[PDB]
Amino acid sequence: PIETVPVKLKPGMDGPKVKQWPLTEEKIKALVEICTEMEKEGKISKIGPENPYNTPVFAIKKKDSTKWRKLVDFRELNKRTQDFWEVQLGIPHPAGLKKKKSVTVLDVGDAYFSVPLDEDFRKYTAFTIPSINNETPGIRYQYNVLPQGWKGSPAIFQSSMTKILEPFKKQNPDIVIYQYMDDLYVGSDLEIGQHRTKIEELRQHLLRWGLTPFLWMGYELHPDKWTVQPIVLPEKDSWTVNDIQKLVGKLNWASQIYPGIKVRQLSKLLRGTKALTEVIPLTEEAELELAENREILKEPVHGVYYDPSKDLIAEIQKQGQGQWTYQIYQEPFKNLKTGKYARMRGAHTNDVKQLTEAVQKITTESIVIWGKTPKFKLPIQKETWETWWTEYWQATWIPEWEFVNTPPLVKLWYQ
Amino acid sequence: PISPIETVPVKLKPGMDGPKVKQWPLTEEKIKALVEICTEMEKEGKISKIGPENPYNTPVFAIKKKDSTKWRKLVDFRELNKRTQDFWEVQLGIPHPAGLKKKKSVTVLDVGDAYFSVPLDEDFRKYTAFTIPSINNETPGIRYQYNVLPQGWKGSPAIFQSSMTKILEPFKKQNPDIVIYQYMDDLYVGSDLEIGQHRTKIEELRQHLLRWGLTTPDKKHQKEPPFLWMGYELHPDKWTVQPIVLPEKDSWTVNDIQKLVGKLNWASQIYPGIKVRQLSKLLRGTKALTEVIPLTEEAELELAENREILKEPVHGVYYDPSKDLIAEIQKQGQGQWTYQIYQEPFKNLKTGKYARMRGAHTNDVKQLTEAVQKITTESIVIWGKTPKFKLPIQKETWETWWTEYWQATWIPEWEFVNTPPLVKLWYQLEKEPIVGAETFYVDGAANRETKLGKAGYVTNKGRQKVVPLTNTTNQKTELQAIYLALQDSGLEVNIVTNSQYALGIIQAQPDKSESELVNQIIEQLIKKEKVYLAWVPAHKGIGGNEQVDKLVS
DNA sequence: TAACCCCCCTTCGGTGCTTTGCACCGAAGGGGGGT
Ligand SMILES: Cn1c2ccccc2c2c1cc(C#N)c(=O)n2-c1ccc([N+](=O)[O-])cc1
Ligand SMILES: OC[C@H]1O[C@@](CO)(O[C@H]2O[C@H](CO)[C@@H](O)[C@H](O)[C@H]2O)[C@@H](O)[C@@H]1O
Ligand SMILES: [N+]
């Protein structure tokens, strides 16, 4: 007996028509069981080929989770769905969440399965479950409630969400709560033991509404410990021609980011035509330039700030030896953040797992810091990424990505 | 008393009306035989006559069944297809015998007149209108509309295919011990039951279909192996493809090779070692399908070696979920790779090849990674899991590659199999400058207008060279400069360039290239013992970079 | 003188950075196969 919030697509845009990709045996069996229970419970209903829309579906296991979870790649639907900020159902972002000492991520998407969905919009949530060796043609479904992973689900459910949290928020006025997709971010400055305690409070507080993949899981972050990776110039007591060439090249690249960098006095050291391994001492003018460039690299870039109306972009470089650097920006060469990851799962044996981990780490940081997920530029061949990335995905959202191939001429972000 | 199949709602594209195309001139031979079928479908209930109030029409004609005295009737709904709503096909792939588990009892049957046993949408039958000339359009003629799914309509396959699934759904849930491969109207039924209970199970299903109006003619009911299914032959313990027809025509046109290479690809799924590199190379060029092509020596040898593979009959086995999947790859040369998938040695589930040349410059390691990826996706489709790989590359070679490459790459669990030719890296670039090695500052430039250019170098020992070049580009002169430094240096050399283009190619350790010049550079690199490439920014007054830039510009 | 589906080989034009050249890649259009 709950009326459905009407939802439209952006005018002049069709629905999602994305082909389902092949799934492993274990992923299909988990899907059949999940979709069987969801159909019994009325959350999904079978459809026919007269529905021209489709969205990929697969399954994941979250970190240290042994039970399957269903994930729908609603990226195409989310881009074609009307932006709810224009409908004024947009969720603001608290700039203090990134300042808390601890932040726990709660999967609250399960609560979305109680709110009905606009009947005229249900045909856009269609998905197809494949079968091994194409024994059976595709089994198609569609959603009758708010589907997990859809950008409209947290917006429509926001009104109900603020009600359920009102008691907890007013009893704990210092704890910040942010909602993004199927997840809830709860940050506090309290002691770790007291933080986990207040988290369990909100858990059973959530049952007091569910009583009237599951809620139980929670992952702890620490955004106050997140650091940046600055551009670094090596310190040497003797320099070879090759060292100064590398330095001049690196500084020349860096000048696009820091406009005050100059390389005139250092280039003159390379006037002749010398062997690369020849040791040449610095001139007095070159020593000041090197020190002055380091200072400019110590201070932040001028006039670089976050524009809420612009999309976030993330670039990643494979530095070797389990090292991975990344930069987040909206305008080229105006970086909002630069970082480096090392010793992630799969280090020294699996590049795709490390990159998948890095993509998830960077997305989580962008959500906490700006409430946006960035579009990724991935250092990998398209077919290679597409063949393996689902085997290691452990998040309930999926960011946008594209594929780049940039040979490292200058070691800019990592020595 | 048959059960009526619920109709599927079908619409036209928004803002579009039905098709109005009228008729093409028809020969009397076809006009005659058609009117006989029109009455048969009206009596049988497949078609209705009333069409004076219908402004739409779609042409109709007929041709002969393949090498049969019977005429095959078909409607050209290409205009209606443009105006019909888009459908999402539920047919996602083709089943493969290598994915079938061994079943004690097997049956293969088809549904008689599939499209004509499915009721078309009530409101949509009006748009399927069509007109036949009575006698060369002398008289107006008999008009009809379809009451069922017609052949040639873009929505018929998906609608029938999905309706078939809803009908089979209750039977499968009430008989989980049975396996049914449904491909269009073709059905594969297998079980470990006794042949008696099997034929009982078959008749339960065979009646289950008739209740919804689906006949199962005994003309298409197969009870005894070998079963003809999806273009294969199904034996109790082995499968094989239906025989392949190799064209032996001694005069080859363009279209002759297209049909020839096409059948070889189809054969490569069980016949190991099939190669189509040299034959397909004949096909490269915007030449018409009628042009006759003389077979080169290699293309003629490749075809001969294929005959040697196809002259002997090969069989495949069935899948055993209890055993692991094994995939083994061999290098065939010229960027050709063949593989076999099996669970026990020499009893292949299937075979295949990967010969795609992606990128102007690459190496065997990249191509091997791509072959592994093709096999991986293919295995997830047929068996839903990734096989264990046996690769002709040493662990040391692979580690050096993926750890040093700037792009993320990976191969699933695998082991080395010593089966030459082995995959290796043909050269490796130093990470630090080589002490005591001559340093070549190379550079090149080309006049944009005359296409003329220069390439050369200057070294720390005073060695210099400048070479004039005709019909070239800036990028080519940059590669030429590097080539000159490799030609004119000892076994160890430092090379400094500002060509991002050249470094990007060479740093990826290519062993093969579409560029004659790049291949010559590779030939030089393989001969060297140590090579250190370093990049510097141009126009910054650096070392011999500014000096050599003057010489060549 | 055609409907839908999977595959491979080729060409080609659109895209972006390696720049107004060159390379990557998806869409076709050829062919094989299935109903
Ligand atoms: C060469 N060919 C064929 C060759 C073999 C079998 C079918 C077709 C075929 C065709 C061609 C068309 C068309 N258009 C077509 O509709 N069919 C078709 C397929 C299935 C059914 N049915 O299941 O009832 C009816 C028509
Ligand atoms: O979307 C088409 C197709 O391209 C891929 C390649 O990785 O990436 C896209 O996937 C999304 C749909 O699932 C797109 O909306 C998005 O723009 C893009 O990342 C595949 O994921 C996808 O199948
Ligand atoms: N140059």
Side-chain angles (χ1 to χ4, degrees):
Chain A
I2 318 174
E3 55 272 38
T4 64
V5 180
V7 187
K8 180 66 179 302
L9 293 180
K10 303 185 170 165
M13 273 183 169
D14 210 344
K17 305 171 176 184
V18 189
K19 300 198 181 175
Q20 172 70 37
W21 57 72
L23 300 176
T24 55
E25 177 183 22
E26 49 172 7
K27 285 192 197 293
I28 292 177
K29 283 187 176 35
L31 276 180
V32 174
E33 171 177 340
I34 288 171
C35 288
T36 289
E37 204 55 47
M38 292 184 74
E39 190 185 14
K40 277 186 175 59
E41 299 167 315
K43 291 175 280 185
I44 57 178
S45 297
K46 299 186 174 176
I47 63 177
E50 69 276 4
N51 187 339
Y53 311 116
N54 190 79
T55 293
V57 58
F58 69 111
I60 64 162
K61 295 176 170 180
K62 302 186 73 173
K63 284 186 174 302
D64 292 332
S65 171
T66 183
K67 54 174 165 173
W68 290 96
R69 208 266 197 180
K70 178 160 114 78
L71 182 53
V72 187
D73 184 1
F74 278 136
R75 277 178 298 181
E76 190 59 28
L77 181 60
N78 292 335
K79 288 189 296 173
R80 295 172 180 267
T81 289
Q82 69 179 14
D83 283 332
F84 286 84
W85 274 106
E86 301 164 339
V87 196
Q88 293 177 335
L89 284 173
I91 307 178
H93 178 74
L97 177 59
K98 64 181 169 266
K99 307 185 178 264
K100 289 298 178 296
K101 298 185 177 187
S102 300
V103 175
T104 304
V105 185
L106 277 183
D107 181 13
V108 301
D110 194 26
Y112 296 167
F113 288 162
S114 74
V115 178
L117 183 73
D118 182 29
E119 173 59 30
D120 296 273
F121 196 82
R122 291 173 173 176
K123 62 172 170 295
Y124 297 112
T125 60
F127 62 94
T128 304
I129 299 178
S131 62
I132 302 173
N133 199 20
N134 293 277
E135 170 182 336
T136 307
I139 306 304
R140 291 176 52 70
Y141 293 84
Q142 80 177 12
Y143 269 91
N144 298 322
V145 301
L146 290 184
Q148 286 177 146
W150 183 53
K151 97 175 170 180
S153 298
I156 294 174
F157 196 83
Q158 183 188 7
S159 62
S160 314
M161 191 63 198
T162 52
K163 290 184 186 177
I164 308 167
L165 301 183
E166 258 291 349
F168 198 95
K169 282 188 173 183
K170 302 318 166 66
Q171 294 195 29
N172 306 275
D174 282 348
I175 290 179
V176 184
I177 297 188
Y178 181 62
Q179 186 180 354
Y180 191 87
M181 299 302 301
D182 314 348
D183 298 312
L184 201 65
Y185 297 83
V186 178
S188 78
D189 292 320
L190 314 179
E191 187 262 340
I192 175 62
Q194 302 176 31
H195 184 85
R196 304 188 192 182
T197 299
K198 286 295 184 178
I199 282 296
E200 180 60 24
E201 290 185 21
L202 189 65
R203 284 204 183 99
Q204 283 140 359
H205 183 103
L206 280 175
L207 167 66
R208 291 190 166 277
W209 174 90
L211 204 66
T212 302
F214 192 49
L215 305 173
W216 66 277
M217 272 185 296
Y219 312 100
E220 289 172 11
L221 306 172
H222 303 285
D224 65 327
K225 299 300 177 179
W226 295 348
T227 46
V228 295
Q229 186 69 0
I231 294 173
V232 173
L233 312 170
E235 177 62 22
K236 303 176 161 284
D237 296 325
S238 63
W239 301 76
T240 64
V241 167
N242 180 69
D243 291 328
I244 299 179
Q245 288 178 358
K246 297 294 180 166
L247 174 67
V248 163
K250 188 174 179 169
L251 289 173
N252 176 74
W253 199 112
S255 68
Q256 297 180 285
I257 302 171
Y258 304 85
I261 288 178
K262 303 299 169 198
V263 298
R264 188 190 185 257
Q265 303 299 325
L266 283 163
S267 297
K268 282 175 165 191
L269 307 179
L270 307 161
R271 270 178 177 186
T273 299
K274 305 179 181 182
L276 289 190
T277 62
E278 178 171 316
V279 177
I280 61 177
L282 294 78
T283 60
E284 186 75 335
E285 287 76 10
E287 295 282 359
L288 177 74
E289 185 174 74
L290 178 60
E292 184 168 342
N293 286 332
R294 280 184 178 114
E295 183 99 337
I296 299 172
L297 296 176
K298 295 182 172 180
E299 60 198 12
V301 185
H302 179 258
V304 291
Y305 51 91
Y306 173 61
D307 193 331
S309 68
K310 298 182 182 175
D311 292 325
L312 290 173
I313 297 179
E315 288 181 6
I316 301 174
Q317 302 82 32
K318 170 185 170 185
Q319 300 293 350
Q321 302 290 1
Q323 302 287 325
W324 301 80
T325 56
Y326 66 95
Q327 304 79 40
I328 302 179
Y329 63 93
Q330 310 180 281
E331 299 292 338
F333 307 111
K334 303 299 176 185
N335 289 330
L336 303 181
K337 176 173 165 57
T338 65
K340 185 175 71 69
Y341 294 148
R343 261 107 48 189
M344 297 173 296
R345 56 162 182 155
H348 304 93
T349 180
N350 194 322
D351 265 341
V352 184
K353 179 186 294 184
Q354 305 176 65
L355 177 60
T356 299
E357 183 67 12
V359 171
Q360 293 170 138
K361 275 189 165 293
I362 293 164
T363 301
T364 297
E365 294 178 23
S366 303
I367 298 170
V368 172
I369 298 173
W370 304 285
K372 274 191 178 185
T373 63
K375 181 180 191 191
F376 285 83
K377 293 174 168 287
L378 301 178
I380 182 171
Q381 224 288 339
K382 180 174 193 289
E383 289 69 10
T384 302
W385 174 260
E386 290 177 350
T387 301
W388 307 115
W389 75 269
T390 58
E391 289 298 302
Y392 314 109
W393 200 256
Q394 297 182 325
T396 63
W397 34 250
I398 310 174
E400 211 91 15
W401 55 54
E402 63 186 33
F403 310 101
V404 297
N405 191 342
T406 302
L409 313 176
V410 162
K411 298 189 184 170
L412 175 71
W413 307 106
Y414 183 79
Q415 295 240 98
Chain B
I2 65 173
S3 307
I5 305 169
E6 310 173 68
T7 215
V8 174
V10 175
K11 303 147 66 182
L12 293 173
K13 285 181 177 179
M16 300 188 188
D17 195 28
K20 297 159 182 178
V21 194
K22 281 303 175 184
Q23 184 66 43
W24 279 70
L26 304 187
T27 55
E28 296 191 9
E29 57 179 349
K30 299 156 188 171
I31 294 172
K32 278 167 185 176
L34 292 180
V35 69
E36 180 182 10
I37 309 174
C38 308
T39 315
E40 293 292 318
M41 294 198 184
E42 183 180 7
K43 166 184 166 62
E44 194 70 11
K46 312 306 186 182
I47 297 186
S48 296
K49 184 174 284 181
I50 293 293
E53 73 285 348
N54 192 315
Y56 314 106
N57 178 80
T58 304
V60 185
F61 62 98
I63 49 181
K64 53 110 179 184
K65 181 67 176 178
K66 186 176 178 178
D67 284 327
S68 187
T69 180
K70 313 167 180 188
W71 282 90
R72 195 160 156 111
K73 186 230 168 185
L74 60 96
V75 189
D76 179 26
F77 285 117
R78 276 185 288 186
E79 187 58 32
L80 175 57
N81 295 336
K82 292 183 183 178
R83 299 150 185 267
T84 309
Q85 64 160 107
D86 291 323
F87 297 85
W88 191 257
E89 302 296 338
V90 293
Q91 179 66 197
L92 310 183
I94 311 301
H96 197 274
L100 301 174
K101 297 173 203 191
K102 189 176 167 311
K103 291 306 175 189
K104 195 184 302 176
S105 299
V106 173
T107 308
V108 179
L109 59 79
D110 290 19
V111 167
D113 268 329
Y115 283 8
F116 299 154
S117 306
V118 178
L120 185 55
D121 180 72
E122 188 73 17
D123 334 285
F124 201 86
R125 313 186 194 191
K126 63 189 66 161
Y127 303 97
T128 65
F130 54 101
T131 48
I132 184 189
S134 295
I135 44 176
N136 298 348
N137 302 276
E138 167 186 325
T139 60
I142 317 181
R143 297 191 60 191
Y144 286 112
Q145 72 174 11
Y146 270 87
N147 298 343
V148 290
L149 310 180
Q151 310 200 342
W153 182 50
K154 88 176 183 179
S156 297
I159 293 178
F160 161 73
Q161 199 164 182
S162 183
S163 312
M164 186 73 202
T165 306
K166 290 182 174 59
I167 295 177
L168 291 169
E169 204 279 351
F171 193 83
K172 309 217 301 176
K173 178 173 57 183
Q174 302 175 40
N175 302 280
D177 306 339
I178 211 174
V179 174
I180 303 176
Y181 272 70
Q182 62 152 310
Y183 185 91
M184 276 297 190
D185 52 336
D186 177 30
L187 280 182
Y188 163 94
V189 188
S191 65
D192 287 326
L193 302 179
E194 176 246 354
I195 194 66
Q197 299 177 318
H198 177 87
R199 300 179 185 278
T200 297
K201 269 309 173 60
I202 291 300
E203 295 310 314
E204 299 188 359
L205 172 74
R206 193 167 211 267
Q207 310 309 317
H208 182 111
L209 299 172
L210 202 53
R211 298 180 314 174
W212 301 86
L214 294 179
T215 57
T216 49
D218 291 315
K219 176 181 177 174
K220 305 181 169 199
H221 186 139
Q222 307 181 31
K223 297 184 178 184
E224 305 308 327
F227 305 92
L228 293 77
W229 175 75
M230 299 301 300
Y232 311 95
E233 312 172 4
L234 300 184
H235 301 73
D237 297 277
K238 82 184 177 184
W239 69 270
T240 183
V241 68
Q242 293 168 12
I244 317 296
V245 179
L246 265 176
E248 295 182 354
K249 183 68 177 169
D250 281 343
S251 183
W252 300 92
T253 62
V254 167
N255 194 95
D256 287 338
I257 309 302
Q258 299 178 330
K259 180 170 184 178
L260 171 61
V261 174
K263 292 206 169 191
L264 290 168
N265 289 329
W266 170 258
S268 65
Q269 68 182 294
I270 189 54
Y271 282 95
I274 297 298
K275 303 178 191 180
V276 303
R277 163 72 74 252
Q278 307 303 332
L279 294 167
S280 300
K281 233 186 169 169
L282 311 177
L283 186 60
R284 295 182 180 270
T286 313
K287 306 183 174 183
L289 304 183
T290 56
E291 173 179 352
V292 176
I293 268 61
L295 267 51
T296 61
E297 180 183 338
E298 298 84 338
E300 199 77 60
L301 171 59
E302 183 173 77
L303 178 56
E305 304 171 311
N306 288 333
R307 312 272 194 177
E308 288 292 342
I309 301 170
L310 291 175
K311 281 185 181 182
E312 198 279 338
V314 187
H315 74 90
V317 307
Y318 297 116
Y319 175 57
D320 191 333
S322 53
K323 308 186 190 74
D324 274 344
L325 286 170
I326 307 297
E328 188 172 341
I329 304 176
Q330 299 88 36
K331 177 185 176 182
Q332 295 183 129
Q334 306 96 58
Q336 296 177 102
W337 310 78
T338 183
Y339 62 87
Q340 305 81 40
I341 310 178
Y342 61 88
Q343 299 183 282
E344 291 191 4
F346 304 110
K347 295 173 173 182
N348 294 337
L349 297 158
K350 73 179 299 291
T351 63
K353 63 166 196 73
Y354 176 81
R356 183 183 182 172
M357 170 62 169
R358 66 158 36 211
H361 330 291
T362 188
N363 61 37
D364 284 333
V365 184
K366 285 173 174 192
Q367 293 187 337
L368 182 63
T369 305
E370 295 155 15
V372 165
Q373 290 161 187
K374 296 286 185 176
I375 296 168
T376 292
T377 297
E378 179 176 285
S379 301
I380 294 179
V381 172
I382 299 178
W383 305 284
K385 67 182 200 192
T386 296
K388 307 303 173 293
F389 287 95
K390 293 183 186 307
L391 305 180
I393 184 177
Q394 299 207 8
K395 294 277 172 174
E396 296 69 15
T397 306
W398 173 250
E399 178 184 344
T400 296
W401 173 248
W402 81 263
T403 58
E404 305 290 359
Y405 197 38
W406 58 85
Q407 285 218 136
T409 186
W410 185 71
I411 288 181
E413 197 176 324
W414 65 279
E415 70 182 26
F416 167 65
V417 55
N418 192 3
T419 301
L422 298 191
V423 171
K424 65 174 188 181
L425 298 167
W426 290 90
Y427 58 88
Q428 196 170 330
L429 303 177
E430 295 299 279
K431 294 180 181 179
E432 300 291 337
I434 310 159
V435 182
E438 194 168 0
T439 303
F440 287 71
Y441 296 84
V442 307
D443 196 353
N447 189 279
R448 183 165 161 181
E449 304 305 327
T450 62
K451 300 282 174 288
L452 296 166
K454 304 168 182 183
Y457 59 74
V458 64
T459 80
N460 64 295
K461 292 170 81 183
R463 179 185 322 269
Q464 308 187 16
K465 168 176 295 187
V466 179
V467 171
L469 302 168
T470 64
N471 187 34
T472 186
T473 70
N474 281 324
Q475 294 85 335
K476 290 191 180 197
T477 65
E478 289 163 6
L479 287 173
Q480 200 75 59
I482 290 166
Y483 178 57
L484 292 174
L486 292 172
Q487 284 189 280
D488 300 343
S489 58
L491 297 173
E492 298 176 355
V493 56
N494 303 310
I495 299 178
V496 177
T497 172
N498 48 250
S499 180
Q500 311 181 34
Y501 164 79
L503 285 179
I505 293 172
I506 296 175
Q507 284 185 347
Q509 302 164 84
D511 64 19
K512 64 179 63 57
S513 179
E514 285 171 15
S515 162
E516 66 300 314
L517 176 55
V518 177
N519 286 324
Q520 294 178 295
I521 286 170
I522 292 169
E523 183 195 332
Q524 290 298 298
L525 289 166
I526 294 177
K527 291 192 300 175
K528 298 291 180 171
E529 258 162 42
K530 289 187 180 186
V531 176
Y532 176 75
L533 288 176
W535 177 86
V536 297
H539 305 146
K540 292 298 169 178
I542 285 173
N545 177 263
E546 183 195 326
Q547 326 298 335
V548 64
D549 186 69
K550 297 174 195 178
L551 296 177
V552 305
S553 300

